[model samples]
Target chain A: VSEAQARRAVADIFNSTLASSAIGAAWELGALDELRENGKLDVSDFAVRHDLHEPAVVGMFTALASVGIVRREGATVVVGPYFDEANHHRSLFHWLNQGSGELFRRMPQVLPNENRTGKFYQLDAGAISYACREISERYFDPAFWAAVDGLGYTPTTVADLGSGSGERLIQIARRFPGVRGLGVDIADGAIAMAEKEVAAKGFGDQISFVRGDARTIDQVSARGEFAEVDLLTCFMMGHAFWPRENCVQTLRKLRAAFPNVRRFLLGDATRTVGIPDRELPVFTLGFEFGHDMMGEYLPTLDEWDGVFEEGGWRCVKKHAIDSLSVSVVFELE
Target chain B: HMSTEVSEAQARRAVADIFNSTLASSAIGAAWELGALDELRENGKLDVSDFAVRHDLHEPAVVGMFTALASVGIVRREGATVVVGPYFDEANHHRSLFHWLNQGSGELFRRMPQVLPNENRTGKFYQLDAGAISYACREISERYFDPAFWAAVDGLGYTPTTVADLGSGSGERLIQIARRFPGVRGLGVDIADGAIAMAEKEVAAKGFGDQISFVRGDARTIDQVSARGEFAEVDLLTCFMMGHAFWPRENCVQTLRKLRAAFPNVRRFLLGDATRTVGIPDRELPVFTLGFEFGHDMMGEYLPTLDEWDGVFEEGGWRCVKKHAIDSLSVSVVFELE
Candidate 1:
């Protein structure tokens, strides 16, 4: 057949395999993670997760083993040597394990129609969240940590608002034993998981998990005994806080809760760089042409500074952490 | 000069990365076409509804297109939500079929993008060589064309004899025939060197060292190469889908006239062509129509309607005899030079 046609057929096999619940279950059981961490996991893990008899899984792995994404050592399965060091960071895994599942589930439906109307509807939010979160966790987190170290202030109380898994909270608590931490998430399942992790880490006394809507951190602050939080951090959650009006409301509440906040670090996609003006038509109208397109509401440098000022804070530093993300630190006025 | 040195391998990897990104974005077009964005907004994130909707795509013509784009890794599926990742952003600036597909298929639904601006402006068909032709033929062979047809032809008293392949693309079919009919002499004829080079390799690889050879010649004007006993003595003269590659009335009439004069008593002349069949509704059959039209356009003529084929053959110096038509999609006609 034609090369295009042959390629099309092979692609069908790839997509069908990807869409299978067996692969999803492999991700859920953290088989890929374990394989990645241990230089490679055993092939038996795939067979068990896929519920395929050992022979079938082996055959499948044999077919895929050459592709360089997975490797086989004797009878064991392992992540390929090219697992991408850049993608192996803790935040990347958090995004992959936590955010990837939600994004993949919604893409099939919205994608086709997106071409016709040049408009993106709503389900794209998960995709946007994943992208935004990756930039934050991967790029901004490291940069922010460096900048925070340079500031010479050992934070004693840190509140990671919208802390989905409480990884950030746990890490901070571990680093500074004197620091007390609180992580807030809207999903009860995530809150429970975070709580379990805290207990497992033996930091239940220092790190607490709370379930609350991030839109109303003021109510959370008033009800909880910790009236004045030291560092109020929002990482990779900026795009999720869209509908500018709601973000404004949320920021107002955050300021009131942490009046003595020493550092206000917010990370999000940069709306004003890398992309050329000529290409904006496609970005703005070609496929994802809509008010809710991820980059549309992404704050420009000046826009971010304005937000901090409007929220009763003085912008101290703004650093472009990566192509799509920026970290803006503000001091309480 | 502190020049930054990039190795050939690194440059190749960078190019491949760019290519992969382009493919991924194109793949995402299928998802975008299914209203994935709105579904995301309504459902909060990707869900089962998105999957069902994609599975329910109605257009078969674009299914392969969508699948091809996806294979290139332009579109990535994360859980249930489909996202246009790094690839889409990179390709978003270029004017590409994938991008256009994502934009919408209203006017250019089955249109293959023009590669050459000159061809687009001049309106001339650019002939591809044997390798290119064989690649397409192999794909067609796997999907639609059958080897049984060739098998049947080889069994019909055509063995242990000299043969001429009219449009021997890369000599692939000729090589197959040579293997089946051992020790048979063969001549490969085509206008393109791409075909000749491939034909030479096939003939040599089979150790038909002195038995088979090739000539660069046009079928419409066979007189230059088909004189003396060269053409008249050949036991079998084959033309598979060749008429569709030549100009309709003029080239078709010329080819038939030349073959008739050169081979006075040719055993059998094989002709292959597609005639619309299958009874598929127009909308359901857009891809088939597009494929057929592409072949027709390549020949610089419309596929002869049934009436047109009858008129052309009646006036030509050939009598139509045995016929094998399969699935109405393809028809093979056997005729004698009268």
Candidate 2:
């Protein structure tokens, strides 16, 4: 690179980093979501309404506007040409900055072979789950619903393993009012979140959350109740139950746990290990790097099929999540 | 020197700049903390494998850090060894600024929602690492301002027996001054208790405990230090880098007026700072300009231009005797006032 080019690159790097922080800040402050819903926003009014700092709001919006993520007209901000792409990519920003930002920053401390004793990476579990749900909702949900519609039946009783906010269960209950839902999560935080959301949506009686491991949820307190589950669904977290043996075992156990379940919908981000870094998309690097930092294995699609086959499940269909380069919703029978 | 049209490859490279830079901040900051930058500077080259093992760092991570550093010409890798690149010295100079941004003022920028609103504002809403700012400012002063500062003092044909530096971080500046001008007794004043204690430790270690001293008081409230120390004979009173803190024309004027009142015997007052530059196009702005301006903007502080500084100086009862500019930092200047 020429000296001028190199210098500009340095400035560009610093500016972009700041912009990414600005975008992440906007997301954290709920401005992006508000903008997405409302199409335009008045900076001062939004700050006052949200009880936020007015200058800080303006400062972050200016940063966004510079990057063409939003346009500033007088005091109002409207979505720019790059807004949709940026808003879509906000999840990756969240994953990088909020989810495992500290971990990545402390790369030397965490990445060392000697420092691999305890959990090296600390995640904002809330952001991670939120990003996952957003990814599922925006990118994967279309294929998921398509697969469900193609099944030619509405599930009356659904069990959602690793159900984060219970939003999906609430949606399921809304679609099929006769449906009863069971949400299982290992984290008390996730369970509390799902429970709160379910209650907020007035689906308390129809949807129930149990704090239990999704891997061995068969032995949970609600085991007897899970027998009536007509559909078993897991999303964004199926890889957690991985490494051939554990995954095969979990699949078998899941089959037994929901004995009357006719179809199982397991959706997850698969490992794209061989893909070059330059060729990889936004979430791919974070998904791969974050799991690797936490010492968790992410199974490839073929590896997933191996588990399904060994576990005695038939892969009835494969539905691609269009935007996510290495993700799929598998219809198992 | 033939000019060629920009290609699609060049445009793609421009797009890659975003992610490259986003990751570079973290990598370079971590590298600074990890001593990789220092090692590269000292050794002229660093073997990635040995450096990783020596630091007990993950080899791949260390390599990746260098790769990011190399992309910006901070370093260039040759197989297993990494050597200094074109921007090595420049990047090293900016390390402290990066630390100040990434560690000191980063969270404030990140949580602007909480910091900007009056109703939700709390002590926690806008907090910066005093230690980080202290260290960063010290380095900036040492590298960028010291030459012009020394030149300005020397050019004045002035040597004071007693000197006092306001906002004196760890008292390093005073110690340096004392070391340069022997028998120069100095008092360092700062608002931070930790800075006072640190200066005390440093002074004692440097064996300048008797010649140099420290007092804790806010720069804006010079009256707070009137009863605290012997400032009657402090002929040379100075404030550097943080001259912006005494701002908005009125506060700065009052503070400047108070400095003369507080140190009545002071004959020379040298104030050095990075001034606000206006009308510079976005592409022409320097490295620290945007970061510095944006940071202070977020802090809701106004950076004064040279014209504004002249106004504050004249109003505050100090005659601007001479001005020496530190051209490397662009808008930085040391103003000798009497």
Candidate 3:
């Protein structure tokens, strides 16, 4: 590449990075949803109604329009062709920009092994939960339901590990009303949020949440809550129980913890390899990068195969989620 | 033909553009902070494993950083060794600006929800690292503005014996002048505590403690500075990069007029700044111009254009004797006023 090519490339990278933050800002400000609902956004009126800085509002739209996410028609902006695509992927953008952006900024501090002490990476838990819920609802839930229903199994009691906000269980309960569910999470905020949401969704009696790490489920399982759970599901966090040995232990622990489990459905987006940089899809690099920076290893399909075998699980089916290109559900028994 | 496959591909690439760019920014910043870029500059190549072990760093993450950097032409991988790519120097030249945006103004961009609202703007909704901004601007001045400034001074046939640097972040410019002209004495006035604290140490460490002094005060209001004795013999009053603060023609004129009275013996007022360009398209803007404009706009500050500065100079009772244009940034100029 020529020097001019290099210069333009770096400048575009800088511009787009800031532009990503601006796009995330628009999402956070509720502009995208408003545009989605109304089909058009009056930039001035929105700023006035929200009491936002006029230039920032203008700048946000200016950037959006530049990228063709919105088309400016006089003072109003209407949805452009990419608006739907951007909206579909806003959760991933939020997770990348607002949730774990600072970790990347603090990469220097965390990169050095000596400085990797005392919880080196801190992410916005609320943001992570929100992103995860949205991504699941939009991208992964349909595949999950299909995979389970395709098993010809009607689970009477279900439990979800790393069940952030308990949304997955609520969705399951809504799909199969007679089902009882339990949610296991490690965060105080996540558990509180899950409990509140479970109550708000009028599923307090059918669903309950416990604060516990999925990796160490024996103590929580010994409490006898998970014993009756016949269908176990873990999504987005299969990578957490990684590096083979720990994952095998965690899988075996799940089996022991839920003795009557009919089937275990584990879903995750894996680390992709050998794709050209430009050809890589959304959430692929971010998922890999986020886990990488947090000192967590993401397993590929081959690695998952090894883990499932070592844990004494048989893969009955592998369900591919087309929307999330690199993600899958492994139905194990 | 724009088939469905073509459209999806375009959409995928578009989203990937943003993801890759966001990752690239973080990668370059990390590379900069860890001295990987500098090491590459010195050695022209770095063995990834050896570098990681030497720094006691996470090897895979560091390799990931180079991967992102390599995609953007800042570095290239050859087996296990990383070498300078085509845009290495180009990216290195603007690394400070990137650092300023990514780290200095990081929280501001990260919390735009809190910052953009009119009601929350007055609150402590966002904070910038003054030291980082100062350090970046100081480096920017050294790399871009220093040559133009000295040329303008030489063109005006001025031999400075005493100088007062307004908005002096680390006092490096004044120290450079003192180093060039051994008899020169200087004073630096700045408002930020972090910058002033940094400036004092820098001056002391450079062994110019007696020759150069610093005071903490707003450059916009020169009277607020208490070090009046240091300004007594100031033959040159220099304000670089912060000349935009005294803006909006009327206030700028007043500030410019008051500077003469403040620095009694100053013969020349050298104002160096990137003035707002008149008609450049946003798509064609140079590296820092967008960020520069965006940052100032977020703070509700006006960046005067070259013509606007000329108007302020005339209205404030100063005649521009010489002008030095810096083309690297958008319409930066050093106006030698008499």
Candidate 4:
């Protein structure tokens, strides 16, 4: 490699890890949280209290301070002026890097062929974490919601596909008082949880849940829950519907099955811009790389428009939080 | 869209992104280790289930990894089969720094998250005798280390009548200095048995066995080091990157204080380490130092910035008269005892 290229490589790979490891280290050592809670702590005292090596901890904080995560006033450590920049985004990093952390570092080494159940990889895509992540990411949903709101087509019925906790259905029904909602998910536990929430919210008369796949919505449509849906909402699970053949067929079948449906609003994580996503959203890495472990392929935004056209649906409007996420509302009638 | 044309810039950017993220980096490692790349290259197209069997990986997990790899054109798919991308090895094996992204250094990066909580945790690394042990030292020795250091060593003209070395990994540092100044007697100190043992082998192999000797001892514990009688009247004491390991500010300070007393005739100290640019907060930093700074931070070691180094060096009875920022993040400081 040329010296110029080698210099760039040193900065790209090594310096990048230096920051990530140090930030992760402080989080692991409880230094960040402790200092955040107590206002400030001396470096030596903090190290001794946390059973950390004095030099390493200083090195850690000094780096953190440089990145605007920690502020050092002399030898004492305090939260930085820009701690929240790292704070608000830190857990998301942990969630993305949790189970896959080692695999990322040891790229050429394959993940074990055993059960991934209860692992972060699994939980990261599961109901509970999905709900919490959605809630944390609520700030980014306003634009998507605005797109739906500005559609100027009020619906009497909304069919929510892959409804993890049934919040989307609850939301639509709550906004349009007389609107009825039906939610579908393959996970029985998720459907059951949705059932509990629908009952508690006293929307029992207006909302319902079905443990069924979206590709086979005909099975649920037969149960009268699919009574001529006016709108269909599918969120963030489009990658699972691929096989090109299966997804194409599924999209067409979805349109035909819901006979009276007008518009289908579907959104999921999109093609990644990659790198640290410093200027991009946090979920970008997880959206692209997390699926790699499962051998799933994610199509870019323009490609999704092709999927819509081929499925006999007309694209009406598209919305996005960032490159990490994008949604298209297609008119199916 | 069906055309498998990945832009050169996009692929390079994606690979760069992969470097910054632990998951992508780790997934690449898994994909490589599992021979996913090899299997796909051989078969041209791979069925997920069957490929998993041949590679000895879980079908879903293997798919998961390649899916990530595909995001960067490292691999792709054709309906029911996986298509591996551009040999992915073009950059890795060609560059020394890039190799760090794969092997022992990669292992350190791999275990970073696991070690974050238990700060005292030690990674099983630095096969000090192995050619790989001194990978960084050897690579940079040609470019950054040699000219800057040899210049200082020659200008001082003190030709090392006797020297005590504390961070001799693979003996490259000592052997070079020894070769420069013939018969400059040396004693090496290292904490790891693997490192100590390796250096001795290197010493003997080079016929410096009579001139250079080694002892296994922790540098932090001055008594463990000084009582060996090698510390007495040493012309110079040299410490490399291991200086950070003797930390917990006070302990390092105490260690430094004792070093002066232990080696009464020690005239000079040549300490080198990759340093984080100190002070000037609210500024962006060079990425290499992050590897130096944050990697150590994860280990729960406190690395002093250059100014912070001055604190302990002064407090511990030494004055840093000259400092060298040996090309960006790497640095070497020449200090004289108070």
lDDT of 2 by residue, A181-262 (tens): 9999889998898888888878888999898887786578885888799898988889888777998898888888888888
Predictions' DockQ, in order: 0.02, 0.30, 0.54, 0.16
Residue-by-residue lDDT tens digits, candidate 3, B200-313: 898899999888988888877786667876777788888999898998778888887778678878888888999776555434446776676666667777888888888778
Candidate 2 vs candidate 3, DockQ winner: 3
Candidate 1 Cα lDDT to native:
0.49
Q: Per-residue lDDT for B176-212 in model 1, tens only?
A: 7777777777887888777788778877887876878
lDDT of 1 by residue, A122-208 (tens): 332343343444445655676677656755578888888777667788878877887988888777766786789789889889888
User: Can you give the lDDT of residue B291 in candidate 4?
Assistant: 52
Better of 1 and 2 by lDDT: 2
lDDT of 4 by residue, A1-333 (tens): 455544443343333344444554555557667767886889988767766556656656765564445666778988755454455445444444433444344333334555433442333234234434443345335754775677678989888888878888888887889898888898887888789988999999999887888876656544664656888888767767775667788888887778788778776656643332232334555555556554567776666767776776788776655323343333344
**Ranking, lDDT, top scorer first:** 3, 2, 4, 1
For all predicted structures, in order, the TM-scores are 0.44, 0.86, 0.94, 0.55
Better of 1 and 2 by DockQ: 2
Clashing pairs in 2: A52-B117, A53-B116, A53-B117
Alpha carbon deviation, residue A131, candidate 2 (Å): 4.0
Candidate 2 Cα misplacement greater than 4 A, ranges: A27-52, A71-81, A98-130, A151-154, A216-219, A242-256, A259-263, A274-280, A289-320, B1-20, B41-49, B58-90, B226-228, B280-285, B325-331
> Under CAPRI classification, how is model 1 graded?
incorrect
Ranking by DockQ: 3, 2, 4, 1
